[PDB]
Amino acid sequence: SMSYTWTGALITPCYATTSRSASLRQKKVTFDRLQVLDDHYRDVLKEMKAKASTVKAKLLSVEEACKLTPPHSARSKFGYGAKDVRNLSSKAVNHIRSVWKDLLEDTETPIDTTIMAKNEVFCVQPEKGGRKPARLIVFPDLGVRVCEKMALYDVVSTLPQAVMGSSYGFQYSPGQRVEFLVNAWKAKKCPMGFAYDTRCFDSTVTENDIRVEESIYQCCDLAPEARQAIRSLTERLYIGGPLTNSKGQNCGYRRCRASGVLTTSCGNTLTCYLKAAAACRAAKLQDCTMLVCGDDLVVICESAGTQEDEASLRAFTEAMTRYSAPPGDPPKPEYDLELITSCSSNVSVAHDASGKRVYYLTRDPTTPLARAAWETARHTPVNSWLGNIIMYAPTLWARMILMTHFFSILLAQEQLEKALDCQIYGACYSIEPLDLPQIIQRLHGLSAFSLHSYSPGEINRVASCLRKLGVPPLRVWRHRARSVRARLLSQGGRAATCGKYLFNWAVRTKLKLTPIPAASQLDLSSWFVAGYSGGDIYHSLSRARPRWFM
């Protein structure tokens, strides 16, 4: 069937992407799907289902689902918003219960969704091609979104790890992700790795793929209401349904993956892993190790020879293509771990204070810098700069440019204690900048504060990027950081900890740096568990048992 059909009504609004480029994207994502399954597919599926059978899922109460709703989440068209939901207002709660009852009673009627163009900031690079069109977001009403959490929050948080095990990428912090990749690479006699990029993955997801995902969720121990809600949500929402623009006009119809449903990440991860694990068998790849994050797939295997590796890679592609997962860019075999770009990141190595080797994840900093620039210029709902500091804390660019620049602004605005929202693995987190030393110590280790001996390739990439974007050179940043550090140190408490730990690199005479005693208390239990892209998930960071002296 067609992934999408359009009435012709425009995708109306609500360098950066806008609704004007939405037409160009619609042409790309609108196509008929051709899917052929085989024995490898069926075998992998049964193996996945057997592991899913060990899961016991819980039905979330109305109160629990409401607290998971972001405060700025889209308002319902039924006279209430995210604030009313979080406060457990009578109107919001009564509507949610009516939506739930309707899922238990109605098993067939398609549920309405809103289609909208995403406004994301990308960089002005005219050296190769032109500006990329806006990505599209498809989401149901706020009421349907709360019910999705009640039925599937515990499923989508628990089931992917039980099924895929160590292959589930969202169970890893950036440090654990590097540990997984390095251990996998060094485990092979002669290693070969590749990244597989699917052209419009959400559009390649067929209605059978969605029914197959349900067959996996149905293996959980579920409360009868959860079982019926999952069944009704599959037929009425996940399989497809009608599209409505921001103005209320009928836009068309969807028969592929919705980007803004709770099961988007989980379903995409399961589907990608299933087709890839089956394709690995068809291509007859040796001792495979996979790492899957939604549509992002990386495979580390045992090399069979340059010509053989090229041949097996074409065979994997032909299998993936049959499964309705064709590539955008054809996959390339890599014989260095540092040469693999996975989740827009690559492995690099530095040294700690004692000269010991330390692996970390980095990336080209063009887009993180351009987005941080937009964020200082115009106040945005999500602060990509904060998330980049959290995720890329051990990197040369996040320490010298992002940390320095934003701590100087927070010092000037007297907003260090002010909690800001950032997206990590699709979920929204309300974090206070003062908590950054503690967070970094937990996700990356004490070493992240005393890392040095960066590679020539990494230094040159950071330096070239700064030149290309008109950003002052690294020496200017070291000078600015010494002032930021001094001002922070003088303020005491958590602010001094920010100066001492985050800007230790900026001083000629480096400090000892003992572990931060309060970092243990940080409740990070809901941090590197699962992916919730388009899931509309929110968590405010909390401290467990605070000591009076902290």
Ligand X SMILES: O=C(Nc1c(OCc2ccc(Cl)cc2)cccc1C(=O)O)c1ccccc1
Ligand Y SMILES: O=C(O)/C=C/c1ccc(NC(=O)C2(NC(=O)c3ccc4c(C5CCCCC5)c5n(c4c3)CC(=O)Nc3ccccc3-5)CCCC2)cc1
Q: Which residues bind ligand Y (CB under 6 A)?
A: 369-370, 372-373, 376, 401-402, 405, 469-473, 476
- Residue 133 in contact with residue 18, Cβ under 8 Å? no
The residue whose Cβ lies closest to ligand X is 387
Q: Which does 426 bind (CB under 5 to 8 A by kind): ligand Y, ligand X, none?
A: ligand X
Residue 420 makes contact with ligand X by CB under 6 A: no
- Residue 128 in contact with residue 109, Cβ under 8 Å? no
Write down the least CB distance from residue 476 to ligand Y, Å.
Answer: 5
Residue 343 makes contact with ligand X by CB under 6 A: yes
Write down the least CB distance from residue 424 to ligand Y, Å.
Answer: 19
Of 379, 376, 387, 400, nearest to 459 by C-alpha is 400
Q: Which does 373 bind (CB under 5 to 8 A by kind): ligand X, ligand Y, none?
A: ligand Y
Is residue 32 a known part of a binding site?
no
Of 357, 332, 359, nearest to 345 by C-alpha is 359
Write down the least CB distance from residue 37 to ligand Y, Å.
Answer: 47
Q: Which does 138 bind (CB under 5 to 8 A by kind): ligand X, ligand Y, none?
A: none
3-state secondary structure 90-141: HHHHHHHHHHHHHHHHCCCCCCCEEEEECCCCCCCCCCCCCCCCCCEEEEEC
> Residue type at 362?
T
> Residue type at 245?
N
Which span (18-26, 34-42, 153-161, 417-425) binds ligand X, by CB under 6 A?
Answer: 417-425
Measured distance CA(388)–CA(372) in Å, rounded: 9
Residue 168 makes contact with ligand X by CB under 6 A: no
Write down the least CB distance from residue 226 to ligand X, Å.
Answer: 26
DSSP 270-305: HHHHHHHHHHHHHTT-EEEEEEEETTEEEEEEE---
Q: Which does 524 bind (CB under 5 to 8 A by kind): ligand X, ligand Y, none?
A: none
Residue 535 makes contact with ligand X by CB under 6 A: no
Q: How many residues bind ligand X (CB under 6 A)?
A: 16
Q: Which does 391 bind (CB under 5 to 8 A by kind): ligand X, ligand Y, none?
A: ligand X
Return the C-alpha torsion angle 534, 388, 361, 346, nearest 10.
70
Measured distance CA(320)–CA(173) in Å, rounded: 28
Write down the least CB distance from residue 455 to ligand X, Å.
Answer: 17
Residue 294 makes contact with ligand X by CB under 6 A: yes
**Which residue of 361, 372, 451, 516 would you call a contact of ligand X, by CB under 6 A?**
361
Residue 531 makes contact with ligand X by CB under 6 A: yes
Measured distance CA(307)–CA(318) in Å, rounded: 17
Residue 424 makes contact with ligand X by CB under 6 A: yes
**Which residue of 89, 423, 430, 520 would you call a contact of ligand X, by CB under 6 A?**
423
Looking at residues 192 to 221 of the shown chain, list those that interact with ligand X (rule: CB under 6 A).
none
Q: Which does 376 bind (CB under 5 to 8 A by kind): ligand X, ligand Y, none?
A: ligand Y
Q: Which does 150 bind (CB under 5 to 8 A by kind): ligand Y, ligand X, none?
A: none
- Rounded to 10 deg, the angle between the 264-282 and 207-217 helix axes is 100
Measured distance CA(491)–CA(434) in Å, rounded: 12
Q: Which does 299 bind (CB under 5 to 8 A by kind): ligand Y, ligand X, none?
A: none
Is residue 336 a known part of a binding site?
no
Is residue 141 a known part of a binding site?
no
Measured distance CA(146)–CA(62) in Å, rounded: 8
Residue 425 makes contact with ligand X by CB under 6 A: yes
Of 359, 380, 382, nearest to 458 by C-alpha is 359
**Which residue of 297, 391, 434, 516 would you call a contact of ligand X, by CB under 6 A?**
391
Write down the least CB distance from residue 127 to ligand Y, Å.
Answer: 16
Of 268, 231, 262, nearest to 147 by C-alpha is 262
**Nearest CB to ligand Y, comparing residues 311 and 476:** 476
- Rounded to 10 deg, the angle between the 436-443 and 384-391 helix axes is 40
Write down the least CB distance from residue 383 to ligand Y, Å.
Answer: 11
**Nearest CB to ligand X, comparing residues 294 and 365:** 294
Write down the least CB distance from residue 350 to ligand Y, Å.
Answer: 21
Q: What are 384's two structure tokens?
A: 């990509």
Which span (28-36, 49-57, 96-104, 386-394) binds ligand X, by CB under 6 A?
Answer: 386-394
Write down the least CB distance from residue 387 to ligand X, Å.
Answer: 3
Residue 388 makes contact with ligand X by CB under 6 A: yes
Residue 380 three-state SS = coil
Residue 249 makes contact with ligand X by CB under 6 A: no
Q: What are 60's two structure tokens?
A: 């979330």
> Residue type at 84?
D
Residue 259 makes contact with ligand X by CB under 6 A: no
Residue 177 makes contact with ligand X by CB under 6 A: yes
Q: Where are the alpha helices (DSSP H) in 283-423?
A: 306-322, 366-377, 384-391, 396-397, 403-413
Pairing relationship of beta strands 286-293 and 296-302 according to DSSP bridges: antiparallel
Residue 236 makes contact with ligand X by CB under 6 A: no
What separation in angstroms does the CA of 223 have from each of 227, 363, 479? Answer: 6, 44, 60
**Nearest CB to ligand X, comparing residues 70 and 294:** 294
DSSP letter for 50, please. H
Measured distance CA(380)–CA(483) in Å, rounded: 27
Q: Which does 387 bind (CB under 5 to 8 A by kind): ligand Y, ligand X, none?
A: ligand X
**Which residues form the interface with ligand X (CB under 6 A)?**
174, 177, 293-294, 343, 345, 361, 387-388, 391, 423-426, 531, 533
Known binding site: residues?
A: 197, 295-296
Known binding site for Mg(2+): residues?
A: 197, 295-296
